[model samples]
Target: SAVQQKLAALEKSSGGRLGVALIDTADNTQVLYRGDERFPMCSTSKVMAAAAVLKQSETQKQLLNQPVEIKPADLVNYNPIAEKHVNGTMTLAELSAAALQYSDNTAMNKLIAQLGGPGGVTAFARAIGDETFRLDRTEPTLNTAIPGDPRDTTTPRAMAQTLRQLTLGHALGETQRAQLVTWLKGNTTGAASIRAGLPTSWTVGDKTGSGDYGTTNDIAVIWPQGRAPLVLVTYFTQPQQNAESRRDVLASAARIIAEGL
Candidate 1:
């Protein structure tokens, strides 16, 4: 009730569609606002792509050590780090970190290819018991954000559900889980919306995604002192005509989330 109330006020001039999903893994209690609406995942797919690699590693053990080469073809917008190393080779692990922590586009596409292209993550979602997550294209293309188009989109609940599985459930092997958490914690993108809402005491590991038409999203795993981890997903998107992302809105939603839960 409080979430819906506050969220309505925050919609503002952007008139964006806002979706919020918060889950306390300790008890499986959930609060969802427009949780079923589709929203472009943008680079957040990198986290899932990396987890898919870890899922593969369970059987392929040596996969992360496999060599990965970067080339001009792989470069895409938002690929600063990747651009510097075109024609260079980095292990799959390096690519994973580059994609996950730095949100490098080229590195993400390379890993997507390694796991069998767009279908890889979609398959990984089904394997993990998720039916709503989908990845039908690579970077740039996936960022199209055509209003109401649902190509590379996922529901807030689905994203939060899958992340909770990887972070707090048995989605990956113990080692792989730790690696995923470490990578997310090391994300160079820091203290934005979700993190900004909390007091200094809570800890957060988050992955962010930005796309066309004011779309901005943050998927966070938060831990309050001496308590269980909470998974929070906030997604916002608006009309391209006057589009503007409201990170301030997200922070406010996150602000109340920590208080009641």
Candidate 2:
């Protein structure tokens, strides 16, 4: 009940659309607050794409170590990966890591292409039981800002379900799952989001998504000392508010979940 009380306060204070989902692996307890509402996934879609690629590798026996050339024209202005490594060859694993760790747009585009474009990513999501998840466009189209386009959209529960598959090793093989989790833990962006609320003793593996007009989200699995890991996901959108406020909401929500657990 404490979680509900805390979340009530958050909903009141934020005065915006908010969706959250929390699941405990130990006791199988769960929480879903406005869980089915659609939210723009932004870079969080990268994780979905990564899972799809890993699945392809498993079914096709494709080698993740094979090198892929990065063309000069593929370089984009955003993200450190493209800025620093303008033109270089990187393994499929390397590109996936960059896309996950740095939320690199260019790297993600290459991965999307590798998976046979947005349709491939959507097929993978559907195959894994995420019915409403869509990947209709690339990152470049993300900035154009259509009000209700399904290009990159998912509900909090849907995203958490996909993540559950990854964590439970139901989607990928052991090796691929381990590598995916490693890359997720290596995510370097959005320090002020969910990770900011955790104590030093806690370890979290997560991915963050940010878009224009105050779209901020985080989906994470947390392990407390001597307790089972739990999944925590939060999505908030308030076009009038700035990014800092949205991140603070995520941090506050995370703290509430940690304390309640």
Candidate 3:
């Protein structure tokens, strides 16, 4: 766990908490550092919600082009789609893209509704063999209590498992899995963890979860030729510092582990 020790020193230097697991998708080897502790998942859970939709839609023969519009009522303050307005239309692909790339809460709510509501998504998780992954009871309401901190309910190992399921085509049929992975790869927002630490040319596909109360999390996969594809999930909460530098440290730690391994 030389990689874990490196990350631990980085966290200690930044006065933050970090929990991580790096799994080699090719070789099936893993490195862990406090990877069992559960923390708030925040919007990163939306990735699962997206996977749920991908699965359900495929089983139901739903078309990806079906229009699901974003509305004024679907937004929460500072949520990405809050200002997109009543007339904005997005297909499932667009909605999932915006939600993952931007960490858009509003987009996630809309996408969740598109997938047949929150219960529908929870059911999807079960179908994907995520027995321990539970959806929050927040109801996905526009104004419902959004979690104030990043400390939702997730563990690093579970996060890693979730990503592995997606990448391994366990969450969807063959065609649907390809599409979902494409959408995940298009994610551009790397404000929290793994994405920032990663090399830009490596086809890094990931999602970030962060909040006002020191909750930061990331899930990512790296695909490189002649090497095993890798899945890294890191979640942190209740860190001592809340500055921008916190993100830098988290992402850097992830990169260190991924590369060192």
Candidate 4:
């Protein structure tokens, strides 16, 4: 792949490990570098969890707008957006947005609970034909990134294709898929990740994840000008640098991937 070699410098600069997967939705063609390896997913797992809710809620039908009460015991420390409504109530749709857009710890937990624990999400992955995506623990603990534990991990190819399933495939019914993609398109926290690598005119919706040991990542569905949409996955674990310092590698790798494509 012509695009594959452009990441060589970033592979060295990541200071630990870097992986990328790019798939053209038009043909499902892939360009991968270490795409099968495991890097901690961090909070990016929330996106998959949110999609699982959209699928499971279809049978229940009462889950989307029914307000569920949040408790003091439910929230973890990472709830800048969730704490505002804590000990109060939020709907499944609202909680899913909070979890995806704000990376709210407790909101994500509620969604996981709604899905009958994290395994339901794994089952959702299997139902969609993904064999690699899995989540073992909930948030706060799931952010451990402990120098390579295999719990709660997904390959770049798995995640990119799973995202493709949500956007371009039939993971959800019409309205449900649009709702999830809309939430991701409005995500506000990815200034230094994949969003920074693209030109302003082309539209993109993506999710970013950061963890201990300099693990920083983003997965995105990008719509380039006059072209079919593509899914790009970038995951890295950089033990050699501080957390903030390791972020730009995502942008750098993304810029290279975007240009090479």
Candidate 5:
């Protein structure tokens, strides 16, 4: 009830649809706010894509160290890491790290391309009990002007549940989970979101995403000092507020959840 009260206050000034899910992994306890509603995933879809590709590598007996080239055409303007590594060669592990840590678009595209595109990502999500999550296209499509372009989308509850399974090692091997979590722990792109909401004694491993139509999201695993770990997911969309305000709202939501816990 405390969580609901806090979230209701947030909804008053959020300026758009707000989706939230805060779950205690140890007991499956959850506080959900509009958790079933969908929002475009944007870069957060990269986390799902990472899991899919890692699974593919294990099943196909492919090595993460296998070298892959990033041709010039694959380079995109928005990603700093990709721009730096354009026309260069690196192993799948390197690309995955860049994709997760920097939220590199080119690195994610290469990973998705290797697993046979968005359909493969979608399949992986469904297999993991995230029926509401959809990975429809690559990053370039994120900014398109179409009314409804079928971009990647997911509910806050689904994203949090997927993360719970991942942290439980249900969907990935130990090595894969370690690698993914490592990258997430070192994520440099989402400093202003959930992580910002944490106390110094707490830590969060998270992924952030944003795109057209006022989409902004963060899904994270929160570890409180000497306490059980929690999963906090927040999504905001539609044209009603500035980017900074939405990010602030998510941070405030995270703090509220932490305090309640």
Candidate 6:
């Protein structure tokens, strides 16, 4: 596809480097480039952790609206200015949605804490055949409880598999799968890459992750009839760049790739 050529050209000539993998959710076909290489997942890892929590919850046939207390400590990764008023209660369901929608670090850490621990998260990823995915944090505590390593990572292909499972009802049970998809649909903070490629009317349930050096990632699904919905994970590392422009380039590439597909 010309999309591949275009993206490669952009990376080589524009001082932007990328590692990505695109998968057709209809079937496990892959279009890859340096996709097997692993990189930090940042907040995107939370999605996998969230699924594990839901899986355990579903097995227990628990209600998602079950109340959970959001302690002041839960706001560790939250914006300091906004953390003061976050105390009180919210449902497990709301926490799941807000975890992605706002990319709330505190919310995600809390959910991860409740899911047993990082081992529990690794368990879910492995269960879904996301072998390249891993967690660096070992302690089962809030955001402050454990130290983070820059190496916490997953390959783009693994991210695609994780997303596809969530969509196909393969990752979680049917009921929880639908619920997870619904929560993912509420994702707003991480849509830049996939959003660039879709029509305004088209919907993208996506998440973005930013990290040390110059890392930015957008993992998303583009939904449209006739055309197969795709799982796209684009990660970028660049030098002396405008962050927004870099993101739009990734977004533009995603649109081009979708059209080619």
Q: Summarize candidate 6's per-residue lDDT along 121-196 as a digit string, tens digits.
A: 8877888787888776632222111112334677887788788887764767888888777777777775566686
Local accuracy by lDDT, each model: 0.85, 0.80, 0.69, 0.84, 0.79, 0.69
Residue pairs in collision within model 6: 190-208, 197-255
Q: What are the clashing pairs of model 4?
A: none
Q: Write the per-residue lDDT of candidate 3 for residues 99-127, one digit (tens) a residue.
A: 77777787787667766666676666677
Query: What residue runs in model 5 are displaced by over 4 Å at the alpha carbon?
Result: 60-62, 143-150, 240-245
lDDT for 153 in candidate 4 is: 90
* Candidate 6 overall lDDT versus native: 0.69
Highest lDDT: which candidate? 1
RMSD after Cα superposition, model 4? 1.5
| Each candidate: RMSD | 1.5, 2.0, 3.3, 1.5, 2.1, 4.0
241 Cα displacement, candidate 6 (Å): 12
After superposition on all CA atoms, how large is the RMSD of candidate 2?
A: 2.0
Once fitted onto the true fold, the runs of candidate 6 whose alpha carbons sit more than 4 angstroms away are 79-85, 138-150, 239-245
Off by over 4 Å in 4: 240-245
How do the residues 55-171 of candidate 4 rate in per-residue lDDT, one tens digit apiece?
877787777898988888887978876788877888988899988888888988988898889898888889999899888999888877777678889999888889998987788
Query: Candidates 4 and 6: which is better by lDDT?
Result: 4
TM-score of 3: 0.85
User: Per-prediction TM-score, please?
Assistant: 0.95, 0.92, 0.85, 0.95, 0.93, 0.85
The clash number for model 1 is 0
Worst 10 residues of 5 by lDDT: 142-151
Candidate 3, pairs of clashing residues: 40-151, 40-152
Candidate 5, residues 1-261: lDDT per residue as tens digits?
977987888878776778899889778898999988777788888888888878777666666888889888897746667777667787888888888888888888888888788888889999878888888777668533123444577788889899888865568888778777887888898888888788977878898887766677888987788888888898877664343436777788888887786
